[PDB]
């Protein structure tokens, strides 16, 4: 199986919101997806889990939607602390592309 | 509550073993798998594989596979890996996380909850030089 991350880069701004796209190679169930934050020299940490079960103690604005082969991670308002790479890995993690945010 | 730690040694020469080692220090080894990520300098997160704490079960990489070894003692509550014919390609940073909720118990039965990943710890660094 194969995953692909679009888009590689982003720099915004505060009070905005974002988009990502994550796109398996087949069709995959709505279980085995899970989204990431990882900061440098920090320990990265779950955002959401099974693709719409919010993760415990991260805030609102993270909500993320897909069905099928079609994934997408949304920040409704964006913050200067959302500086952090974000991944996007199945189940057993065998895939990997990565996408950082930047703030403007 | 439960917090864990990964070890290992800072240089490593080539044509050796590496080895590193994950303690957990806030629960048991019970009902959980138990996984390792590498990190590359220049690339993103990578992964390794991921064992059952009976031993029972192991799920590799296929790059990785036949130069990789992945160990769990119930008791010691530690976690060792083991790796084989040491690049400097290998200069890289581990971690050492518990996967997702699922106490799938048999062989027979075939080991079926495996959907998060939760705590990661701060990781390690192995550089390969002489």
């Known amino acids: 199986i194969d995953l692909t991350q679009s888009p590689r880069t982003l720099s915004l701004s505060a009070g905005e919101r974002a988009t990502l796209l994550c796109r398996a190679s087949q069709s995959v169930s709505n279980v085995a997806l899970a989204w990431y934050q990882h900061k440098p020299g920090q320990a990265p940490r779950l955002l959401l889990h099974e693709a719409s079960t919010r993760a415990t103690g991260i805030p609102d604005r993270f909500i993320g939607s897909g069905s099928g082969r079609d994934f997408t991670l949304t920040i409704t308002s964006l913050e200067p602390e959302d500086f952090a790479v974000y991944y996007c890995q199945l189940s057993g993690r065998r895939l990997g592309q990565g996408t950082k945010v930047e703030i403007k | 509550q439960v917090q864990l730690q990964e070890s290992g040694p800072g240089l490593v020469k080539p044509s050796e073993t590496l080895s590193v080692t994950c303690r957990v220090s806030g629960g048991s080894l019970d009902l959980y798998y138990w996984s390792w990520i590498r990190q590359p300098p220049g690339k993103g997160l990578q992964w390794i594989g991921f064992?059952?704490?009976?031993?029972?079960?192991?799920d590799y990489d296929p790059s990785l596979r036949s130069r990789v070894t992945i160990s769990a003692d119930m008791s010691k509550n530690q976690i060792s890996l083991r790796l084989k014919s040491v690049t400097p390609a290998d200069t890289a940073v581990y971690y050492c996380?518990?996967?997702?909720?699922?106490?799938?118990?048999?062989?027979?039965?075939?080991?079926?909850?495996?959907?998060?990943?939760?705590?990661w710890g701060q990781g390690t660094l192995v550089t390969v030089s002489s």
């Open positions: 996380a518990r996967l997702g909720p699922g106490g799938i118990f048999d062989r027979w039965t075939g080991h079926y909850g495996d959907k998060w990943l939760d705590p």
């Open positions: 064992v059952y704490f009976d031993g029972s079960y192991g």
